[PDB]
Amino acid sequence: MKLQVLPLSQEAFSAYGDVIETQQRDFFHINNGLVERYHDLALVEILEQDRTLISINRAQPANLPLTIHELERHPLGTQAFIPMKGEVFVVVVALGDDKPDLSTLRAFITNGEQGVNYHRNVWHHPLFAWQRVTDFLTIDRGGSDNCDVESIPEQELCFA
Amino acid sequence: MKLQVLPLSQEAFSAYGDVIETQQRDFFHINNGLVERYHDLALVEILEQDRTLISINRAQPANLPLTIHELERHPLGTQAFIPMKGEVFVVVVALGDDKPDLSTLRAFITNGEQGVNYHRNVWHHPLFAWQRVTDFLTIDRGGSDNCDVESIPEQELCFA
């Protein structure tokens, strides 16, 4: 079928993780307002101390139209991605215990000022960029270990 | 008295934390090259289990001449800062157990493609931006608790 891609917002994303962004978020005035601290945007929840790792994933832009047929999940850790030069990107997510719960399947496009943190065990699509090669500051467990991949009905993202 | 600011490099910064960047760093080819995973750039070390938080700190640019007279340190966690739109920024670091070991005092300027992760307990300067307001993606314990602050001999950064 067709998967409609919608604007990313914290509320629409909240069942799946957290949106990293400043717009309309509560902050603390630090150093007599020299810094505005937009606090507690996401929580890293990783099983092993020694595996709370910062990396950079440099991702090629997808060809469009874009069709998807599987999602991946990381039971052992959250996974945050924050584009490093203001890039818009696209995310697909689903809840579901053993397998993607297809009724929970949603797709979002960011506004270029947003990163995402997927909660542990939440289904999402493998990382890809939008339009241009994009470096994504990553905070996750790293490796290719304890990643479950499950097929989904083939569908085409629609940016109407 | 004059503190000279030098190019940021991994080898020069290594006693103090890690440089987050891709240039000349080992990576993994993922999804038949579609992603390059620059892995293990920095390790977040926060021992309390619910306190690894992602935030954004939006920092005003300092005025030059830049003069410093104190450093802060966080005994309970690492603190990473990665600029969000490729901004250059300036860092000041020192080692030292109870107090800044003045012989270890260094200043660095980044090339715009770099973030930093201060190791736990490393003295560094309170966050400031360079030239323009800069948003820094932040991974740390958050709050203003368990932060030690220590005067150092006043000094002027020199960018010669």
- H helices present in A6-159, as ranges: 10-13
Match 């891609």 to its residue by tokens.
Answer: A5
Query: Cβ contact (<8 Å) for B59 and A137?
Result: no
Contact predicate A42/A78, CB 8 Å: yes
User: How would you class A42 by CB atoms within 10 Å of its CB: exposed for 0-12, middle for 13-18, buried for 19 or more?
Assistant: buried
Phi and psi torsions of B101, nearest 5°: -85, 100
Distance separating alpha carbons of residues A129 and A87, to the nearest angstrom: 9
Question: Domains in chain B, start-ordered, CATH in brackets?
Answer: 2-160 (2.60.120.480)
Distance separating alpha carbons of residues A91 and A81, to the nearest angstrom: 10
Structure tokens at A86: 């203001």
Structure tokens at A102: 């297809």
Q: Which residues of A touch B110 (CB under 8 A)?
A: none
Query: Cβ contact (<8 Å) for A117 and B54?
Result: yes
**Chain A residue closest to B87 (CA)?**
A85
Contact predicate A115/A21, CB 8 Å: yes
Distance separating alpha carbons of residues A116 and A43, to the nearest angstrom: 11
Which of B77, B72, B75 has its CA nearest to residue B92? B72
Query: Cβ contact (<8 Å) for B85 and A86?
Result: yes
Q: Enumerate residues 6+ apart whose C-beta is below 8 A from A80.
A: A20, A42, A44, A115, A116, A117, A118, A138, A139, A140, B54
Q: In what order do the strands lie in the sheet with A28-30?
A: A28-30, A35-43, B53-59, B134-140, B79-83, B115-118, B17-20
Distance separating alpha carbons of residues B93 and B3, to the nearest angstrom: 11
Planar angle of CA B87, B93, B96, nearest 5 degrees? 160
Question: How many C-beta atoms lie closer than 10 Å to residue A140's C-beta?
Answer: 22
Q: Do you find a cis peptide bond into A65, omega within 30 degrees of 0?
A: yes
C-alpha neighbours within 13 Å on the C-beta side of residue A66: 22
Q: Which residues of A touch B35 (CB under 8 A)?
A: 57-60, 126-127
Q: In what order do the strands lie in the sheet with A115-118?
A: A17-20, A115-118, A79-83, A134-140, A53-59, B35-43, B28-30
Q: Which residues of A touch B45 (CB under 8 A)?
A: 49, 52
Provide the greatest CA pair distance for chain A.
54
Method: X-ray
Distance separating alpha carbons of residues B44 and B66, to the nearest angstrom: 29
Query: Cβ contact (<8 Å) for A37 and B55?
Result: yes
Measured on CA atoms in the order B85, B89, B95, B99, is the torsion positive or negative? negative
- What number of residues does chain B have? 160
Amino acid at B71: L
Distance separating alpha carbons of residues A114 and A89, to the nearest angstrom: 9
Distance separating alpha carbons of residues A119 and A17, to the nearest angstrom: 5
Contact predicate B154/B69, CB 8 Å: yes
- How many cross-chain Cβ pairs, A to B, lie less than 8 Å apart? 134
User: How would you class B155 by CB atoms within 10 Å of its CB: exposed for 0-12, middle for 13-18, buried for 19 or more?
Assistant: middle
Query: Cβ contact (<8 Å) for A54 and B20?
Result: yes
Match 């005092």 to its residue by tokens.
Answer: B105
* Distance in Å, alpha carbon of B158 to nearest chain A alpha carbon: 22
Q: Do you find a cis peptide bond into B65, omega within 30 degrees of 0?
A: yes
Query: Cβ contact (<8 Å) for B84 and A82?
Result: yes
